[PDB]
């Protein structure tokens, strides 16, 4: 207890100190980025010590050190919860951020506000550990809206650009629409129960909880960019690539799922919501993946890869497998961070070019980046015994062999196939074929920082899933008996996806003209949801205002 | 057709100006002129001691910095948090509530030396 | 800051370092080493762990379906 | 305006780029590019201006349903990824007039040269004012062009901002 | 209270008798000291208010509004001395006198123990307020908007007088403490309905309620910075404080006589928050923000629940510091570009780095980022109106979504983009301007560490 | 970093105040 | 499930109801039935704090597993042998559920034929 | 610096699929002037690029070697008990 | 961004380098002041294709309006220097 409670809070206080030394003191400017990187370096190791204790004996804590406010029969404390989800997630988030803080030292070396950038990266991390460790809903909101702001400030890092400012406001608008659901849950629990604490919520277990769960689900629809509120996640790639890796693909976007994983005790009983979360996830994984095929910018493709996966997490929530979705979040962070970091090497070497059409022939010019770009891409699709396999495979097994919506079961598998098609398109266009980038060649990735950062997460994309899956305590009755085809449905569609993809790539070589198909145009333009909705709604609200 | 004779001239006249101005933007070897800034012997110590460097010599310097970090940014913070948690947070009801440990069949209790009864005999499946 | 130890090349394949290539092989090959060992030592996960029975082949003796007349 | 001569030419560049996006690979683009060139040279000799226009009417209409939904855009060009990216770093030069004298001591030589440049602008302005007045056609200039200097040691009218505009990549 | 009234009076002899060049230093340094001794008003007890005399008391609802009032005077002197540097000394001293006179009436207004004494001091405030806004007001544009007073007096201040006088003849006293123990139910009746409107319309206009709000944007455009700081920070709160006190003697009629007004406020939040988006003038955008925020306070007061009353008190204090901070930031630009158009100057973060930080904090608290007291107030109002009727979460939710849009749209337009090329007079921020913002946002953020003091007497 | 000289005056607003 | 086509596309009364099953008393064709036996006592499962959904007949193996792992720390490959036992025990448990399904399926067809021929 | 450009005569479409483009352009009767400009992309070391399968199997040769030896160690080490 | 420095001499070489590889033109006739319409005698169409090639050499679009006004190699070189602020 002594060690568990003390070191659970050194991590949170260890991250803040770099923030504190910015406001006061003057011991070391100029070397701030490395000072920050070490804080996360140490905060990770200190965060492992409690994790080992949790594995050994399943020890779990609640720490409510400070009494802040007592609104009559409602007492608000600074309560941290160091349980199954907090203990596993924090080292994963710190480990991923560790490399990114090192990949940013290289990707953002010239930019003169490098110190300011590292201050915002750290201030996000602080508002994310607050979100995950929070024990009461009000403290959850500080993290919920804390990340929402830090997205605005980082997405619009280059504030001269007019698209950056538009993309930042778009991030706020969709999240705050989702945060209507969060307050609705907050109001319901106080009105019908009597606390924002999670402990009392689970103890009472309301039987009729349709309204609060719709509100909670609505928060996940906006925060994690599900269908209906998804356009912001693609358009949020306007920020520096380290931002897109750390925030809008590795961690922050999971908080929408993380909110539903927190409330499994209630959602397990409520079938009516399970259908909605399943249906909500089913459409988003297909739609975004369907859009991913025809995209041409490497950041945009990997952006839709995040959304398609996130929908798979939402389906896992629906099929009543909350602990798998948590595993998918942790395994997903490693290889999706590596993808973005690798795409950062290509973009930085080709002089700020994101279009894959102008990339190619890098398979030999950038060995290290190419190796990781393969390792990461294989994890996503479902290569056996890679980090992605331990999570995605089970999710497909549990979806196939469970009482579920037929269409939702089918869409998941179709989207899993599509996950194979655009896993190759990054490889085929960016790694294979003759070069297509401008003449002057400056492709150079021989830097220790970019390499060490990529090397570390490369190991995670291999062995992290195996270690995590073995150590974590059993929590459900896994299904290991099923028809052979359902058992290997995941692998077959992944294999069938590759075959169709490679054939499509080869057809691109053949000297035959291009023919426009409505299915093709719908894919490339994102279904016209961004175009119609970002034009009709802004026009109506702004125009109605004068009347 | 390209630039009329005046246009060709105007671009030429400005072009020369633009190139000179940009040339003026360069800095002199002495610049930027700075006040010296103080150097405490803590700075002086490594300035010359590591001038030659080499792997075995500077590994001490790398371990030095981490030691200064560890003591100030890990050891001292955990004394404060431990002093705070042990003598202020745990001295109030229910501040730190820990899930009771898992007690399995055939375990020994530290408090009472109790021994939990063993489980029934399994149906002796083939295993 | 090694003074751009890599030198740019024009319309030509870039200069690479030996160390860069070695590490790329080590990890890319290591991926295959890991993947292979896992099939070998734990092939069941990909191919199943237990035999799925066929419901129809069961007898009414075990299913205890009484005779049509009974 | 731009006259039928230019208007058609622009279509050529715009149509080519979209093709280049569609075909992706260089080889297919080159071959399909030559075919495109043929269609252009075919009617290049049409001497009927009335007919020439009609070719453009259908030509553009054909293009409208050939355009790649996402055409490649140069990163630092309007609509591109890096467009306006560095405008935050571009600080206009006049801000240096507000620097504290202690700061300006850090860069003596540059600021010394700046005084020279400022003196050049002030003296040239009165001369520059006249040159536009005399050349100006009464009733307001009809075009936005400007006249180059017509004497030795005279700078072209309105030269301060074009000369001293912030660099492309200041930081 | 005399410990505060007297030293505030002695600021007038201080201003007049000071060295000509040391009026600002004396008045600011001694108006700051008065505020320091105003932290003694937090000697609050759980059961009983802090009653000093037969005339003045101080409970938890007036203590923050008093501390906010006396905190603002030294701020209003720092804000105004720059644009009063031109004008002669005797005119300079009168301006400071009007501000000292306003504080003296406001400290007596929030603490008045009898409602007529409150009413008289409630209207006496307008005398200094109108002189400041019309004599030193930047606008000589000629409005003819006195009809808004003719509407106010005829429809507001006069009925409040006849009703307050009527009530004393019936209840026998207007001492607030006595009304707590002698109040009787207000039976339904066409005569009582008119008593209810008489006792509330005067305060609804000052809030202002939707439909009666059009005077506020016009007043903010005319007023100098000092006029807007006091107007947004405090004078709007006199209506809120008035309604919290006077709803004691209006029950149970408030149950059914508050439906028409809540529908104005709930729907008013959306209408004004949307109008903010299309505004072209900063001071009008900030002025319409106040109407959107005060619309919550009107709803909170009228649903009369223990949570709503805590919500309204936090919003009133939190809104006061935030909005006056925004008015000052808008004035800092106007003191440069010399225009109130928002679009004129853009990308100002390139030329004024630190000032862009203040804009960011001011915007964050306006859009209500947790855990600021701006959200502690708003959340409580949202929680209680949910019980009043679950549907209100729809209107409350939409207002949160729009509020973030003009909050940041104001940030994006003025602080982001490409700087206007031709504007070359953006001199570096003065220490006066940075100290002025820090004195709005350091207290506002520190209140989150100890939020109980601002949560009112229902805490 | 990779070249000598070529250090160009960086135009920034006054940071002294 | 190929069987699904039988229910929705095919005749309904023949195929079992996944929700309302079972629809026959246990012994209607099973003279002498042996009650399922729970090895682990209620107190033990409660003391182990096993997740409720994991408090099924196969618990006793699962309890043994966790006990091994807690002892086998920091080795996390130690307790493979126990893992299989519980996993297989579920596999047998799952099979019994499959038998429950078919037993329903056979009876439903048997009922159909009997009443049809009599109705003829 | 100098940044010497390689001799412009080196780049010839012959020996590359660009040459094949010219052939098909000959059938129509047209000639591509820009072919020589694209030559560098198809020559000089960029010519040989593995296929999708080849990259996927990058390092397999070392991977299998380590694997086969690996099972031997467990086989042998287990053989020694 | 490592170091992609550009200097007038280097730019001049690259622009000519691209020009030489255009088959319609001859290597030896080409020179810095070779008006495309006259000294090398090329259609206006061919003038477009030269521009599109130059964009790819340096990877930055030349606006349509300003492309027309370019008609000789020496014009192109100085245009690049202007956009990319090449001074020495
Ligand atoms: C609060 C976190 C703020 C972190 C921060 O510094 O960011 C400011 C930062 C300002 O710096 P910047 O704009 O990024 O760039 C640097 C600037 O150019 C200029 O900044 P700089 O780094 O170059 O210079 C130093 C620094 C600071 O300069 C200073 O010297 C600070 C001195 C003033 C602080 C005084 C505080 C103490 C008050 C006095 C009373 C207490 C002491 C008395 C007690 C006595 C002992 C008992 O300057 C500033 O930050 C200016 C604003 C400082 C005052 C802000 C108010 C605090 O702006 C933001 O980051 C906005 C915050 C965005 C939201 C993040 C938080 C969201 C999640 C909520 C978390 C909730 C946690 C609490 C609940 C648990
Ligand atoms: C957030 C963590 C900080 C909490 C804090 O500010 O201290 C408050 C705490 C008072 O205890 P509490 O009963 O919770 O009072 C609540 C009334 N609002 O304060 C305490 O109870 C203990 C405070 C003493 C801490 C001793 C350690 C000081 C370490 C050196 C300073 C660095
Ligand atoms: C309201 C209660 C006061 C009623 C008096 C109304 C008439 C006052 C008046 O009009 O005087 C104006 C006078 C302007 O004269 P001036 O040229 O500025 O002389 C130098 C100022 N020290 O300036 C003045 O008013 C000077 C007197 C200011 C009043 C305060 C003087 C402090 C000491 C006596 C307390 C008087 C309180 C009243
Ligand atoms: C013009 C006159 C308006 C009508 C005022 C009136 O007639 O009041 C009637 C009522 C008399 O009743 P009273 O004698 O005091 O007690 C015995 C019970 N019958 O009077 C009363 O009992 C209470 C009187 C309350 C004060 C009346 C103030 C006159 C204005 C009333 C309208 C206020 C609303 C203004 C419009 C707001 C916008 C809609
Ligand atoms: C504590 C000391 C102040 C005394 C001094 O000026 O030397 C200051 C000076 C520079 C600081 C260091 C620099 O900020 C960065 C160092 C490198 C790594 O980031 C570890 C922390 C690191 C080792 C810091 C620890 C401590 O804060 C230092 C060492
Ligand atoms: C359920 O989700 C899978 C449905 C797929 C159709 C399978 C048909 C082929 C197998 C028939 C014989 C085996 C008996 C189950």
Q: Can you walk through the features of this model?
A:
The structure is cut from a larger assembly and holds nine protein chains of nine kinds. Chain A has 23 helices and three strands. Chain A is mainly alpha-helical. In chain A, strands 1-2 form a two-stranded antiparallel ribbon. Chain A starts with a helix and ends with a helix. Chain D is mostly helical and 171 residues long. In chain D, 54% of the residues lie in helices and 0% in strands. Chain D is built from six helices and no strands. Chain D is flat, with a radius of gyration of 25 Å. Chain F has 17 residues and is largely without helices or strands. Chain F has no helices and no strands. In chain G, helix 3 runs antiparallel to helix 4 (80-119). Chain G has helices at residues 2-8, 42-48, 59-72, 80-119. Chain G has 120 residues and is mostly helical. The chains are: A mainly alpha (547), B mainly alpha (127), C mainly alpha (70), D mainly alpha (171), E mainly alpha (459), F little secondary structure (17), G mainly alpha (120), H mainly alpha (81), I mainly alpha (88). At the A-E interface, helix 5, helix 6 and helix 23 of A face helix 14, helix 16, helix 18 and helix 19 of E. Strand 3 of chain A pairs antiparallel with strand 1 of chain C, so a sheet runs across the interface. The structure holds cardiolipin, 1,2-Distearoyl-sn-glycerophosphoethanolamine (3 copies), cholic acid and myristic acid. Chain A: It catalyses: a ubiquinone + NADH + 5 H(+)(in) = a ubiquinol + NAD(+) + 4 H(+)(out). Chain A: Its EC number is 7.1.1.2. Chain A: This is NADH-ubiquinone oxidoreductase chain 5. Chain A: It is an enzyme of class 7 (translocase). Chain A: GO terms for molecular function: NADH dehydrogenase (ubiquinone) activity.
Brief digest:
This is part of a larger assembly, with nine protein chains of nine kinds. By secondary structure, chain F is low in regular secondary structure.
Layout of strands and helices, then pairs:
This is part of a larger assembly, with nine protein chains of nine kinds.
Chain C: E1 9-10, H1 18-41, H2 44-47, H3 60-63
Chain G: H1 2-8, H2 42-48, H3 59-72, H4 80-119
Helix pairs in contact in G: 3-4
Chain H: H1 17-28, H2 52-56, H3 60-79
Lipidation (N-myristoyl glycine) (chain G): 1
Keywords (chain G): Disulfide bond, Electron transport, Lipoprotein, Membrane, Mitochondrion, Mitochondrion inner membrane, Myristate, Phosphoprotein, Respiratory chain, Transport
Subunit structure (chain G): Complex I is composed of 45 different subunits.
């Amino acid at each position: 207890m002594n060690m568990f409670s003390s070191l659970s809070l050194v991590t949170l206080l260890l991250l803040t100190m770099p923030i504190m030394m910015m406001s006061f003191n003057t011991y070391k400017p100029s070397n701030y980025p490395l000072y920050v990187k070490t804080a996360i370096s140490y905060a990770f190791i200190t965060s492992m010590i409690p994790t080992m204790m949790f594995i050994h004996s399943g020890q779990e804590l609640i720490i409510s050190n400070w009494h802040w406010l007592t609104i009559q029969t409602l007492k608000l404390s600074l309560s941290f919860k160091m349980d199954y989800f907090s203990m596993m997630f924090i080292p994963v988030a710190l480990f991923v951020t560790w490399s990114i803080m090192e990949f940013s030292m290289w990707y953002m070396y010239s930019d003169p506000n490098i110190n300011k950038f590292f201050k915002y990266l750290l201030l996000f991390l602080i508002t994310m550990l607050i979100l995950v460790t929070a024990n009461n809903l009000f403290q959850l909101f500080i993290g919920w809206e804390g990340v929402g702001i830090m997205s605005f400030l980082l997405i619009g890092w280059w504030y001269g650009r007019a698209d950056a400012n538009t993309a930042a406001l778009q991030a706020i608008l969709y999240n705050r629409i989702g945060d209507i659901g969060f307050i609705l849950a907050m109001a319901w629990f106080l009105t019908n129960l009597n606390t924002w604490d999670l402990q009392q919520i689970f103890m009472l277990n309301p039987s009729d909880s349709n309204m609060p769960l719709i509100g909670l689900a609505l928060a996940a629809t906006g925060k994690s960019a599900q269908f209906g509120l998804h356009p912001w996640l693609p358009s949020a790639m306007e920020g520096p690539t380290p931002v897109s890796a750390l925030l809008h693909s590795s961690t922050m976007v999971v908080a929408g799922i993380f909110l539903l994983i927190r409330f499994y005790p209630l959602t397990e009983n409520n079938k009516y919501i399970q259908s909605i979360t399943l249906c909500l996830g089913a459409i988003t994984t297909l739609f975004t993946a369907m859009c991913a095929l025809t995209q041409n910018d490497i950041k945009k493709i990997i952006a839709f890869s995040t959304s398609s996966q996130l929908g798979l997490m939402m389906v896992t929530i629906g099929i009543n497998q909350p602990y798998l979705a948590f595993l998918h979040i942790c395994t997903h962070a490693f290889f999706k961070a590596m993808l973005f970091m690798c795409s950062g090497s290509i973009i930085h070497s080709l002089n700020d070019e994101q279009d894959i059409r102008k990339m190619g022939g890098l398979f030999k010019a950038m060995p290290f980046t190419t190796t990781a770009l393969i390792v990461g891409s294989l994890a996503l699709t479902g290569m056996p015994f890679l980090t992605g396999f331990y999570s995605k495979d089970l999710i497909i097994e549990a979806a196939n062999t469970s009482y579920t919506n037929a269409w939702a079961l089918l869409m998941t598998l179709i989207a899993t196939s599509f996950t194979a098609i655009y896993s190759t398109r990054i490889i085929f266009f960016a790694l294979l074929g003759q070069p297509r980038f401008p003449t002057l060649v400056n492709i150079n990735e021989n830097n220790p920082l970019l390499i060490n950062s990529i090397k570390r997460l490369l190991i995670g994309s291999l062995f992290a899933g195996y270690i995590i899956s073995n150590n974590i305590p059993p929590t459900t009755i896994p299904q290991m008996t099923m028809p052979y085809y359902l058992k290997t449905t995941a692998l077959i569609v992944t294999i069938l996806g590759f075959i169709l993809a490679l054939e499509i790539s080869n057809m691109t070589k053949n000297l035959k003209y291009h023919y426009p198909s409505n299915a093709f145009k719908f894919s490339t333009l994102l279904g016209y949801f961004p175009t119609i909705m970002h034009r009709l709604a802004p026009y109506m609200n702004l125009s109605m205002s004068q009347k | 057709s390209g630039y009329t004779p005046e246009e060709k001239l105007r671009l030429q006249q400005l072009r020369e100006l633009r190139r000179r101005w940009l040339k003026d933007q360069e800095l002199s070897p002495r610049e930027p002129v700075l006040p010296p800034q103080r150097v405490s012997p803590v700075e002086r110590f490594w300035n010359k001691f590591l001038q030659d460097g080499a792997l075995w010599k500077n590994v001490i310097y790398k371990t030095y910095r981490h030691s200064i970090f560890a003591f100030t940014h890990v050891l001292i913070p955990v004394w404060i948090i431990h002093y705070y948690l042990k003598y202020h947070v745990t001295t109030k009801p229910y501040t730190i509530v820990e899930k009771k440990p898992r007690i399995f069949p055939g375990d020994t209790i530290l408090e009472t030396g109790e021994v939990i009864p063993p489980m029934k005999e399994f149906p002796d499946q083939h295993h | 800051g090694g003074g751009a130890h890599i030198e740019p090349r024009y319309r030509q394949f870039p200069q690479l370092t030996r160390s860069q290539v070695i590490q790329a092989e080590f990890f890319s090959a290591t991926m295959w080493f890991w993947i292979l060992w896992r099939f070998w030592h734990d092939s069941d996960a990909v191919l199943g762990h237990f035999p799925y029975p066929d419901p129809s082949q069961w007898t009414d003796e075990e299913l205890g379906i009484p005779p049509d007349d009974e | 305006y731009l006259t039928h001569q230019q208007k058609v030419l622009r279509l050529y560049k715009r149509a080519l780029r979209h093709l280049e996006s569609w075909c992706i690979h260089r080889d297919k683009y080159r071959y399909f590019a030559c075919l495109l060139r043929a269609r252009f040279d075919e009617h290049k000799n049409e001497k009927d201006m009335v007919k020439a226009t009609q070719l453009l009417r259908e030509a553009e209409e054909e293009f409208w349903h050939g355009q790649h939904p996402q055409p490649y855009i140069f990163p630092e060009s309007p609509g591109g990824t890096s467009y306006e990216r560095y405008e935050c770093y571009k600080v206009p030069e006049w801000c240096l007039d507000d620097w504290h004298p202690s700061e300006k001591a850090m860069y003596p030589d540059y600021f010394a040269k700046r005084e020279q440049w400022k003196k050049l602008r002030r003296e040239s302005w009165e001369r520059e004012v006249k040159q536009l007045q005399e050349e100006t056609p009464v009733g307001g200039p009809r075009t936005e062009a400007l006249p180059p200097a017509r004497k030795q040691g005279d700078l072209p009218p309105l030269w301060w901002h074009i000369v001293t505009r912030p660099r492309e990549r200041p930081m | 209270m005399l410990k505060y009234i007297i030293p505030t009076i002695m600021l007038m002899p201080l201003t007049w008798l000071s060295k000509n060049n040391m009026i600002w230093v004396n008045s600011t340094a001694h108006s700051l000291l008065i505020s320091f001794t105003s932290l003694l008003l937090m000697n609050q007890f759980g059961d009983n208010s802090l009653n000093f005399s037969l005339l003045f008391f101080s409970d938890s609802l007036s203590t923050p509004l008093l501390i906010l009032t006396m905190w603002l005077l030294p701020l209003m002197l720092m804000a105004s001395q720059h644009h009063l540097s031109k004008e002669n000394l005797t005119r300079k001293k009168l301006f400071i006198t009007m501000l000292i006179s306003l504080q003296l009436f406001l400290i007596m207004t929030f603490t008045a123990m009898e409602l007529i004494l409150f009413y008289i001091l409630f209207e006496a405030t307008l005398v200094p307020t109108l002189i400041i806004i019309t004599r030193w007001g930047n606008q000589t544009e000629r409005l003819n908007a006195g009809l808004y007073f003719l509407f106010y007096t005829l429809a507001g201040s006069l009925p409040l007088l006849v009703a307050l006088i009527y009530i004393q003849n019936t209840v026998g006293s207007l001492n607030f403490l006595m009304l707590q123990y002698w109040v009787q139910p207000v039976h339904n009746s066409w005569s009582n309905v008119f008593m209810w409107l008489a006792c509330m319309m005067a305060f609804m206009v000052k809030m202002p309620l939707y439909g009666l709000h059009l005077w506020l944007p016009k007043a903010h455009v005319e007023a100098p910075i000092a006029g807007s700081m006091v107007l947004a920070a405090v004078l709007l709160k006199l209506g809120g404080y008035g309604m919290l006190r006077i709803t004691l003697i209006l029950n149970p009629m408030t149950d059914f006589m508050a439906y028409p007004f809540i529908m104005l406020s709930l729907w008013g939040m959306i209408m004004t928050s949307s109008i903010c988006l299309r505004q072209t003038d900063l001071k009008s955008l900030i002025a319409y923000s106040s109407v959107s925020h005060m619309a919550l306070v009107i709803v909170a007061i009228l649903i009369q629940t223990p949570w709503s009353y805590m919500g309204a008190t936090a919003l009133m204090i939190a809104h006061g510091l935030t909005s006056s901070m925004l008015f000052c930031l808008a004035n800092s630009n106007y003191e440069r570009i010399h225009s109130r158009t928002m679009i004129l100057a853009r990308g100002l973060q390139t030329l004024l780095p630190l000032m862009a930080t203040w804009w960011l904090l001011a915007s964050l608290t306006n859009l209500a980022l947790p855990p600021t007291i701006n959200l502690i107030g708003e959340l409580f109002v949202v929680m209680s109106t949910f019980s009043w009727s679950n549907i209100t979460i729809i209107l409350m939710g939409v207002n949160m979504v729009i509020t973030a849009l003009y909050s940041l749209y104001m940030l994006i337009m003025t602080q982001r983009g490409k700087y206007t090329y031709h504007i070359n007079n953006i001199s570096p921020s003065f220490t006066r301007e940075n100290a002025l913002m820090s004195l709005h946002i350091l207290p506002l953020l520190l209140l989150t560490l100890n939020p109980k003091i601002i949560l009112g007497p229902l805490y | 970093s990779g070249d000598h000289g070529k250090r160009l005056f960086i135009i920034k607003p006054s940071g002294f105040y | 499930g190929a069987h699904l086509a039988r229910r929705y596309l095919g005749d309904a009364s023949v195929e079992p109801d996944p929700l309302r099953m079972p629809t026959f008393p246990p012994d209607y064709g099973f003279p002498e039935r042996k009650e399922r036996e729970m090895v682990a006592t209620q107190q033990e499962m409660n003391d182990a704090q096993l997740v409720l959904q994991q408090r099924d007949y196969c618990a006793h193996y699962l309890i043994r597993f966790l006990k091994c792992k807690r002892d086998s720390f920091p080795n996390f490959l130690a307790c493979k042998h126990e893992r299989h036992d519980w996993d297989y025990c579920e596999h047998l448990d799952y099979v019994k559920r499959m038998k429950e399904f078919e037993r329903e399926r056979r009876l439903l067809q048997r009922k159909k034929r009997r009443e049809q021929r009599e109705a003829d | 610096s100098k940044m010497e450009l390689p001799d412009y005569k080196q780049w010839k479409i012959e020996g590359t699929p660009l040459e094949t483009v010219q052939e098909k352009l000959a059938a129509r009767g047209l000639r591509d002037p820009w072919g020589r400009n694209e030559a560098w992309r198809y020559m000089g070391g960029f010519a040989n690029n593995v296929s999708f399968v080849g990259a996927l199997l990058k390092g397999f040769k070392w991977g299998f070697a380590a694997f086969v030896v690996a099972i031997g160690a467990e086989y042998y080490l287990e053989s020694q008990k | 961004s490592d170091a992609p420095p550009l200097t007038l001499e280097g730019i001049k070489d690259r622009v000519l380098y691209v020009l030489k590889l255009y088959d319609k033109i001859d290597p030896e006739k080409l020179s810095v002041n070779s008006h495309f319409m006259k000294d090398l005698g090329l259609d206006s169409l061919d003038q477009v294709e030269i521009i599109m090639a130059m964009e790819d050499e340096f990877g930055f679009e030349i606006p349509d309006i300003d492309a027309e006004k370019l008609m000789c190699p020496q014009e192109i070189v100085d245009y690049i220097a202007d956009k990319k602020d090449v001074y020495e």
